[PDB]
């Protein structure tokens, strides 16, 4: 999901090892960014579920 600049830089890499390593590094960047998004989403999902679970505990007490 990188912009056109990273793709152009990958094209600029004449040697196959260099372009392949750049592509793998960009794959790592994509995976880690998606990991940050997934971790944050799961964190807040559990937090909101726990917020509702607080009301569930309230109703159980009632």
């Amino acid at each position: 999901g990188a912009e056109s600049h990273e793709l152009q830089d990958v094209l600029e890499e004449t040697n196959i090892p260099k372009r392949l390593y750049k592509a793998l590094s960009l794959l790592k960047k994509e995976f880690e960014l998606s990991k940050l998004q997934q971790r944050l989403g799961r964190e807040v999902e559990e937090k909101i579920k726990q917020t509702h679970r607080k009301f569930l505990l309230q109703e159980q007490l009632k």
């Binding site: 944050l40 989403g41 807040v44 909101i48």
Partner: protein, 62 residues
């Protein structure tokens, strides 16, 4: 929640406590009024931000 106020800024609604206290800290004052102030502050902490009760509490504390 992901930003955790790192995308917005602290609403300062809780900061109203200290704002009013420092707005009063400097005054040599009787004691009954302090306990009334503390009760109003506790109600403010309990009362929701959007409540009309909360708005009247804010005006009375002003």
């Amino acid at each position: 929640i992901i930003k955790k106020e790192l995308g917005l800024e602290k609403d300062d609604k809780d900061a109203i406590e200290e704002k009013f206290r420092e707005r009063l800290k400097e005054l040599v004052v009787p004691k009954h009024v302090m306990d009334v102030v503390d009760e109003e502050l506790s109600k403010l902490g309990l009362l929701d931000n959007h409540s009309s009760e909360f708005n009247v509490t804010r005006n009375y504390l002003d």
